[PDB]
Structure formats: structure tokens, C-alpha cells
């Protein structure tokens, strides 16, 4: 059947019909459930850009119109000719927006509508994909006015290398490994910072030195560039309250800018398609700096504010952590530089599953990723069944170039 | 093969191979997953193959495999099957299959205690008086004075010809839920059916925010009978917090004992509808769930008013910290109380030593991620950042349909 899926909150029930439209097979099977796992030819093509042509000529309105008859013989034509086809820039366009649409994991999605896609498909060199790549910083930052933006450089075609951005995303802190084995900066880039030193770069000794980029450009070995301070905007953290907090001298930017996904529209794959928006402030001030493999603060910050950190049950944790947030919060607010709480950002998702009721019956969304990283059950999302499945297009995991 | 998990803190792998062995279908397809969904689902030659399963289960957990009192069990419960339809446990095989089904539970974050369960067999029971005399007895052992005990009773087998045991209470200890006509609750939401039940069937209801409802008994073929707990029996305990004096004037209280008493215990075949349960709370159950959802108590806003905190916007994250506090209060007041209770790091801690234990004792664990990490500070609990493979295994504890639908 379509799975029928509860609100506990409201008690309100829904049936996820778009369910019945998944591409691509999940990892779960009736004997078991591995949702909480983080990592899950003519004729295929031709399947696949037509059913992404039907996709969007259904979605403008234009089911079998001339139009859309002429789309689908263009795309036909250009397979057999080619062995490939490219998109139309309206189609790479609703084909960004619907691969973020359709993606899980995304608690994001109420924005998708609102996205800025650079066509970068005549890129030819690993210059070129910086200059790019640099425009795209400066208009998705907008002086801290965040822009949803992303960048599609040329798809992959047989007998020719990828681009790739071999950086997870353009801004990383560097991660140096010590000789005791721990990790100055951030632990979740050692390996690519020490790729970026094997490729020349000069690394610093800092807790947040900015990455250079390691760009591939098709059969090259990748490129070292070095973003221009004044591109990579920065938020230094205080707290409102907690005069010390300034002084631990914690910072993060103001930009996600994921790097190593690839997107994949009608069977044609990008993998060079950097995407952002804006932060989720646990992503920063739960996940990235409390996690204990990553910067691993908590206990410094739990000293500072006195706290009792040999009982558990005192909470020294959880109210830590909230500081934490609540400086990233008003730290960014008070740079002026985008950025959304939990509680907005999983009342708008729920929002956003209501309109995609109503639009396509359904919203594939992955729970454990949608359900923020502290205070869960406060927000609406906790309290709220979803179903995961795999629509295209779509935003993927890929293989790191190296 | 089987599923790799991964521990993302550690960087550990594993591999759960005892998911080869799931008994029974989860709800996911290859297609969708619906692992977040809170209800998933819902003879003589399946019962003794499901009986033999078992039998072997226990002859292996006592290392007696191939014993002649291995062979001698399996032919007495084949023999048995095909002679009455069914079959009865033994005293040992019923403690065994007890504590493998809390041991089964995937939601169960306590399971680390899974080895250490008092089991009453009341198979013998035979009127709702006399379930209700064990249930007291229960509350009575597992209650402990506040040092609190886990127990199980297990009242007599599904047997075709009569009707089941049941008892019709979720929990041996509930807050009566009063509709009131502007649709609100007095007291707790969870409970407003079963309330509505107890006045149906001669309950006098009060008109308090926690008033502990009767427990309404069903023996075989009868209809259910009303009894109420002694209060005596009934140990709470009354919510303040250190450091913030007026939370003691919200007069929110929660009882010591948490006693599962809906679920169906079902131990090779054979199924026991009434079964009630109890261990103790970890304190987000009663702080972050019973005391903040929107749906239950819904405490929040007013804790976040009384601790002067900006509740006009969400990113001063006032929703967070009065959470916090209202954890903290349930901590400090059980333990005031000498109620034993878990906060939910050290609950969170002892699950991953209970997976690794698992993992070198069945080489796998199967656990419900989305129950098992705690409601608040999920991420700074380990168990956030484990990989957890969901699926079903038998003796286990399972939902059952309300016996009045
Ligand atoms: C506009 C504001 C946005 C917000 C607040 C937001 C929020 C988030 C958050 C918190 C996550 C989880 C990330 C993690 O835990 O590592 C996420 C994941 C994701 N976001 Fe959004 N997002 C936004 C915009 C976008 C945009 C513009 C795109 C692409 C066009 C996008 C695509 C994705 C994808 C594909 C994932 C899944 C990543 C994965 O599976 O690892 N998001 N988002
Ligand atoms: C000893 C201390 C224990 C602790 C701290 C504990 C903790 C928990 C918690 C926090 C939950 C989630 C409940 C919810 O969110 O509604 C749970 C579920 C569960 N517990 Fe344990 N537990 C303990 C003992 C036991 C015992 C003795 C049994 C049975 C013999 C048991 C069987 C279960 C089962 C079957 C579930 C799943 C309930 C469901 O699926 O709705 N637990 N436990
Ligand atoms: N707001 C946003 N955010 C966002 C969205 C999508 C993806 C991400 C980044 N997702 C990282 C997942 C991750 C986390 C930690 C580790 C790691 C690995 C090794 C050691 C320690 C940590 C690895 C990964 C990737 N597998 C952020 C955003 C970005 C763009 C638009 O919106
Ligand atoms: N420590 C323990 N705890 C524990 C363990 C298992 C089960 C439970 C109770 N599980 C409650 C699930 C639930 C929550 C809210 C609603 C509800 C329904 C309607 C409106 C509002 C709320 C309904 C249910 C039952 N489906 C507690 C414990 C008990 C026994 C041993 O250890
Ligand atoms: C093991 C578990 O899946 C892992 O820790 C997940 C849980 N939920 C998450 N949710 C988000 N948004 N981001 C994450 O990285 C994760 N990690
Ligand atoms: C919709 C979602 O499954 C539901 O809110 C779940 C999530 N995780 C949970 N986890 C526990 N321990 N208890 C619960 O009741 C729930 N409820
Ligand atoms: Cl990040
Ligand atoms: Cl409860
Ligand atoms: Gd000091
Ligand atoms: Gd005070
Ligand atoms: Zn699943």
C-alpha cells in the first residue's frame, strides 16, 4: 500500500503516495532496518532523461505538449548520436532545485524554491573553477545576507575525467595531526588538509586555519588555490552573557558550502556541484564544535562556567551545550550573517512536509538527520513519522577523488 | 553479507550478524524506510518450529546443548504440541525467555540490566482479584521502598477456548487525563481514553492533574473489573528544583515505579497478553517527554516564563534551557527521594557497554536508533553516533491491540 504516517503531536495522518515513486533502492529489507546507517548503456540514460523531461514538462504545465514531444525527441536524438545529452539551462535549473527537494536529509527544504544556479558547464580548467567558485562565495555570502546558491560545472561524460572539488566544502578549518596523535583544528579535515600539504600548501598551526582548495580539473592532478581572506567570511564567537566566552577565541564561517556531493539530473551526472545556503546553528554549535571527534569543547566551556563535571546528573552536559548554541546564535546575529535555530528550522520543515503533501503527496525525509542534535523532542519534527525513500533528481554520496 | 556499523566517535566497524537470524518483517522495503514509525505492524507445525527455536535458545544459554535433557525437552514439547495443540514452560525456561525478551527489545535503552529480573509466574492465576493481588505484589517487590527492583509477572498463556488475561491499563501507574469541553486536558493527555474507561466502568474520577487511575482487570471471558492501588502502595515523588524554589509550587509530581503492562510477551509460540513489567525511569521519560511534549503536560513555556527567560523568540533557545531544568528537577527529586533513577548519559553510557557486550556474546545487537537516543542532547549522548541495526528477534515483548477495540 502507501505507507500511512502519524503525527503524535496533532494526532493528524497522512499517506505518503510519492513513496510509490522511488527511484532507487534504500538499505533496509523487512529483516532489517539500517536507516540510521550515514552511508546507505542507452537505454538506462534514455529511461532516465525521460523520466526527468516528463518530470518537468509535468511540472510547468505541459504534459504532452509539442514542447515537451520536442524535448523528448532533442534528448533522444542527442543519446544516439552522443551517447549523452545536455540539459536546457531551465531544466539544470529545476533539476538543482529538485535534487535539494529531494533530498532526506535536508530540514532546509522550505527554501527550495529559492535557489541561484551558476551554470559553470563550459568550465575548462581548475583557473577557471576557482574563478567560479570565488564568484559563488561572494554572491551566496552577500556580506552576511546568505543566498542559496549552486554551481553545476560540466557533468561527466565517457573517456573524460571529472571535475571534482576534492575539499568537502570550499570553507574547512585545517586538521593537524600532533605527534601524540590528537588533532589541532578541526578533526573531521586531517585527511585533506595533509593532502593540501603533499600538494604544496603551507599549513599553519592554528585551531581555525582556512583550507586551501584542491580543484581537479578532468585528468589533472588537482590544483592548490588559496581563497582570499576577504572572501571567507567569519564569525568570531562570544556570548551574550558569559563575558569569558570571547576570549576561548572559537569561530566558524558563515558559509556551507558543500563540496563533494554530486548531483545527478535525468541520468546525467555532476560531480562538481557545489551547493550552500545558510547554517542551522546546531550544526555549528552542537555538532561541530561539541561532537567529542570533533573540536570537542564541552568539557572547556563546562569548566568556564563552573559547572560540576563528575555527575552526569548535574547536566553539566546539556547546559554547556546550550550555551554554546545560544553564543552561536547571537554571535552570527550580531555579525549580521545569516543563520536559523532549531525551533525555526523544524517549524518550517514541518511547513515545508505540509506543502509537499499537498504538492506530490509526500516528502522523503530521513528522521534521524531531520531531528536536530539537542532539545529533539522540543522541536515538531521529533513528534512527526516520516517515510525515507530515494527520488530523483538528486543529491549523492561519491567517492572521494583520491 | 551482513550490515556494517559503524561507531562515527570510535571509528569502530562492526558487523551484526545476529540480524541473519530476524524471526519476524520490520516495516522497511528496499524501496522506503519506516523506521521512525512508533507501530510498524498490525499453526501446530509454526509452533513447534518457533517452540524448538526457543527450547535450543535455552539449552544453549545454559550450555547444555545436545544434553540428553536438550532431546528429552524437545520431544516433551513435540510430544506436547501435537497431543494438546500448545504446550507449557518450564519455571527456567519462563525466567529465560523473560529476560530474552527484554533482552530482544530494540527500543530499550536500560538493557544493560537485561540479566538481572525478578520473574513472578503467575500462570496459576485464575480471577481479576487474584491478578490484582499479583500486580500489588509486584508494585510492592519492584517498588523496594524507592530502591527500585526489576521485575516481571507473567500471568497465564493464550489458550484457545478462553479469553485472554488482560490488563487494560498501559502502565500499573497512571495520571488520570480529563477532557475538559474546550478540549483541553486536566492531567495527562496520554491517558485521557483509559480514563474515560475507568468512569465507564464505575470509576468516581477526581478532577486533579495527577490522580492515579484504577487498574481495570480482565479475566478470562469477563468483562474488566475496577481496583483501585492502595496509596500506600503507589510511591511519587514531588518535583522541585535545587536552585529554582518556585518550581515546587508548579505541584508536579511523577510516581517511582514505571510498570508496562499493555504489551505481549511472547517466549517460543507461546503468547502472554498479560505480562506487566517495571525498571526504573531514566529521567528524560518523565522531564523531557511526559513533563514538555506539546501533547502531555506541556510544561515548557510556563518553567521558561517563571525563570524569567525571553520566550518571544526561539533563538534565545528559552525552550532548551527550561528543559534542561526541568530534567535537573526530576534528577534532583527522585534522588531527594531516594527513587532510583538514570539520567540519560549514564543510561546512554551503559547501552554502549551492553552493545559491546552483545556484540562479543551474539555478535550483534538490534536496537531502534530513534528510541534509543534520548529526546534532549542527543548528539551529546554516544549513542547518537552509533550505527544501530533495528529488527526483530523472538522471545520478545510486542504491541497488542487495546482489548475494547
Ligand atoms: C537555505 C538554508 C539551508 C539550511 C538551513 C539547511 C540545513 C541543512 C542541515 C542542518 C543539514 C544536515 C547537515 C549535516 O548534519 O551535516 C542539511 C543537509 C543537506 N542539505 Fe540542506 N540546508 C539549506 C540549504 C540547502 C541547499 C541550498 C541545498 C542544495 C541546493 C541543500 C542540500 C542539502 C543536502 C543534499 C543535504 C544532505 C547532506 C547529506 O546527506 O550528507 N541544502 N541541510
Ligand atoms: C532497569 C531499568 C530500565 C530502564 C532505565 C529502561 C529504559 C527504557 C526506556 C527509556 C525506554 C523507552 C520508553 C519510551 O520512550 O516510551 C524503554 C523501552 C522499553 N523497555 Fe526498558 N528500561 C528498563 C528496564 C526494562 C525492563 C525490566 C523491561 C522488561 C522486562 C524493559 C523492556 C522494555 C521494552 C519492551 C521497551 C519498548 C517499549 C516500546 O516499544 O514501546 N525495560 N526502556
Ligand atoms: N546548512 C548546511 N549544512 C550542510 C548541508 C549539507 C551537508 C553538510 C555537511 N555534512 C557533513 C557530514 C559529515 C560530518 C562529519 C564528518 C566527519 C568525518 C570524519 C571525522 C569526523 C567527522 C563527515 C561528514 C560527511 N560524511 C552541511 C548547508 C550546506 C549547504 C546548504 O546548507
Ligand atoms: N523506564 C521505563 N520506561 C518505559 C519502558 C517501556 C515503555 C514505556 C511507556 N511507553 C510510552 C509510549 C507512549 C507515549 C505516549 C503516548 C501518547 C498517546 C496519545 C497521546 C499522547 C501520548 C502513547 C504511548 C504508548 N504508545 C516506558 C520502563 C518501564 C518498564 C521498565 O522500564
Ligand atoms: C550514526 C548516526 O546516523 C549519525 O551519528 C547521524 C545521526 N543523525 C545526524 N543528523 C544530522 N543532521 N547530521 C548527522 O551527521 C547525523 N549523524
Ligand atoms: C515519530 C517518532 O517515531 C516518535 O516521536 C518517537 C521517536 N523516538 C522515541 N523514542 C523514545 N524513547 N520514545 C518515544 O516515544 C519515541 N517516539
Ligand atoms: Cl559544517
Ligand atoms: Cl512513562
Ligand atoms: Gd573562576
Ligand atoms: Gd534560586
Ligand atoms: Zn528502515
Redesign the interface.
Given at each position: 500500500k502507501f505507507?500511512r504516517?502519524?503525527n503524535?503531536?496533532?494526532g493528524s495522518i497522512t499517506y505518503?503516495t510519492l513513496?510509490?515513486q522511488?527511484q532507487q533502492?534504500?538499505?533496509?529489507?523487512?529483516?532489517?532496518?539500517?536507516?540510521?546507517?550515514?552511508f546507505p548503456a542507452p537505454e538506462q540514460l534514455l529511461s532516465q532523461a525521460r523520466d526527468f523531461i516528463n518530470q518537468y514538462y509535468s511540472s510547468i504545465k505541459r504534459s504532452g505538449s509539442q514542447a515537451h514531444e520536442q524535448r523528448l525527441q532533442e534528448v533522444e536524438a542527442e543519446v544516439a548520436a552522443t551517447g549523452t545529452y545536455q540539459l536546457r539551462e531551465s531544466e539544470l535549473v529545476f533539476g538543482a532545485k529538485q535534487a535539494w527537494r529531494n533530498a532526506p536529509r535536508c530540514v532546509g527544504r522550505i527554501q527550495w524554491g529559492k535557489l541561484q544556479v551558476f551554470d559553470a558547464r563550459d568550465c575548462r580548467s581548475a583557473q577557471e573553477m576557482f574563478t567560479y567558485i570565488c564568484n559563488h562565495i561572494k554572491y551566496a555570502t552577500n556580506r552576511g545576507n546568505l543566498r542559496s546558491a549552486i554551481t553545476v560545472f560540466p557533468q561527466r561524460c565517457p573517456g573524460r575525467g571529472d571535475f571534482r572539488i576534492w575539499n568537502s566544502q570550499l570553507v574547512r578549518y585545517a586538521g593537524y595531526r600532533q605527534q601524540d596523535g590528537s588533532v589541532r583544528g578541526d578533526p573531521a579535515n586531517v585527511e585533506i588538509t595533509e593532502l593540501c600539504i603533499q600538494h604544496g600548501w603551507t599549513p599553519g598551526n592554528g585551531r581555525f586555519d582556512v583550507l586551501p582548495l584542491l580543484l581537479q580539473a578532468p585528468d589533472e592532478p588537482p590544483e592548490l588555490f588559496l581563497l582570499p581572506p576577504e572572501l571567507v567570511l567569519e564569525v568570531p564567537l562570544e556570548h551574550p552573557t558569559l563575558e569569558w566566552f570571547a576570549a576561548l577565541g572559537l569561530r566558524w564561517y558563515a558559509l556551507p558550502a558543500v563540496s563533494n556531493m554530486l548531483l545527478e539530473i535525468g541520468g546525467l551526472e555532476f560531480p562538481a556541484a557545489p551547493f550552500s545556503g545558510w547554517y542551522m546553528?546546531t550544526e555549528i554549535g552542537?555538532?561541530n564544535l561539541?561532537?567529542?571527534?570533533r573540536y570537542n569543547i564541552?568539557e572547556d566551556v563546562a569548566v568556564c562556567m563552573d559547572l560540576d563535571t563528575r555527575t552526569?546528573?548535574?547536566?553539566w552536559?546539556?547546559?554547556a551545550?546550550?550555551e554554546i548554541?545560544?553564543a552561536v546564535?547571537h554571535s552570527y546575529?550580531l555579525a549580521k550573517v545569516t543563520i536559523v535555530?532549531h525551533?525555526?528550522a523544524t517549524?518550517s520543515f514541518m511547513k515545508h512536509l505540509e506543502n509537499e503533501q499537498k504538492a506530490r503527496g509526500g516528502c522523503?525525509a530521513?528522521?534521524?538527520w531531520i531531528?536536530?542534535?539537542?532539545?529533539?523532542?522540543?522541536t515538531?519534527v521529533?513528534?512527526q513519522?516520516?517515510?525515507?525513500?530515494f527520488l530523483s533528481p538528486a543529491f549523492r554520496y561519491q567517492p572521494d577523488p583520491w
Open positions: 505507507p504516517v502519524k503524535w503531536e496533532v505518503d513513496s510509490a522511488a533502492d534504500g538499505p533496509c529489507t523487512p529483516r532489517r532496518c539500517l536507516g540510521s546507517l550515514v546553528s552542537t555538532r561539541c561532537d567529542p571527534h564541552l552526569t546528573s548535574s547536566l552536559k546539556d547546559k551545550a546550550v548554541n545560544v546564535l546575529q535555530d525551533h525555526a517549524a522523503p530521513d528522521w534521524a531531528v536536530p542534535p539537542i532539545s529533539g523532542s522540543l515538531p521529533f513528534h513519522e516520516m517515510v525515507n525513500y
